[PDB]
C-alpha cells in the first residue's frame, strides 16, 4: 500500500484490541479513514497521547 495509508493502518492496528474513548472516537475514526490528515508532528502527538512506542506510526 501507499506510505500515507500504512500510517493509517498502524493506527487502526493499535486500537484493534481496544475500545475508542467516547470523547476521541470521532477524531480517531477520521484519522483511520483519511477524512482528517496525518502529518509527522501529528503522528508524534498521537503517539504521546496514547502512550504508543516512539515512532510507532511513522
Amino acid at each position: 500500500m501507499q506510505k500515507k495509508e500504512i500510517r493509517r493502518l498502524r493506527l487502526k492496528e493499535w486500537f484493534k484490541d481496544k475500545t475508542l474513548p467516547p470523547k476521541e472516537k470521532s477524531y480517531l475514526s477520521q484519522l483511520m479513514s483519511g477524512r482528517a490528515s496525518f502529518g509527522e508532528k501529528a503522528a508524534r502527538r498521537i503517539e504521546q497521547t496514547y502512550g504508543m512506542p516512539e515512532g510507532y506510526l511513522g
Epitope: 474513548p21 470523547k23 504521546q48 497521547t49 496514547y50 502512550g51 504508543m52 516512539e54
Partner: nanobody
Framework: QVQLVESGGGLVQSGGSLRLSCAAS????????MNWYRQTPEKQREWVAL???????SYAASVEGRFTISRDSAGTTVYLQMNSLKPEDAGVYYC?????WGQGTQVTVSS
C-alpha cells in the same frame, strides 16, 4: 529507559473493591497516555482500560461500569479503581506505556 511498577493487588472477596496503582519513571504519566492489560487463567493478555495524556478514558466491555481509570493529584501515578469484583476478574494486571511493561500485580478474588 522507562520503568513501571504496579501495586495494590491482593486477595479480595467477590463483590469487593480494590485500587491498583502504576508508577512510571521520569514523571512520564504527566504527559503520556498508558494502558492496563490483564492475564487471566483462561486466555492471555486482554486489554482492560486506557487513559490518554488528556485524561480521556475507555474500558473493555467486560469491566466497563465497574472499573475506573484516573491519575493522582500530582499526575505521576495512574489508578485502576475496581468495584463489584467477580472471580473472573482474577489475574495478573499489567501497566504499559511507550512499549514498556510492568512486572504485573496479582488480583485474587475469593468467594
Amino acid at each position: 529507559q522507562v520503568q513501571l511498577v504496579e501495586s495494590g493487588g491482593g486477595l479480595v472477596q467477590s463483590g469487593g473493591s480494590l485500587r491498583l496503582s502504576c508508577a512510571a519513571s521520569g514523571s512520564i504519566f504527566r504527559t503520556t497516555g498508558m494502558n492496563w492489560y490483564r492475564q487471566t487463567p483462561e486466555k492471555q493478555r486482554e486489554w482492560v482500560a486506557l487513559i490518554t495524556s488528556h485524561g480521556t478514558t475507555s474500558y473493555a466491555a467486560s469491566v466497563e461500569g465497574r472499573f475506573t481509570i484516573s491519575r493522582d493529584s500530582a499526575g505521576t501515578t495512574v489508578y485502576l479503581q475496581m468495584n463489584s469484583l467477580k472471580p473472573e476478574d482474577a489475574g495478573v494486571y499489567y501497566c504499559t506505556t511507550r512499549g514498556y511493561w510492568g512486572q504485573g500485580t496479582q488480583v485474587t478474588v475469593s468467594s
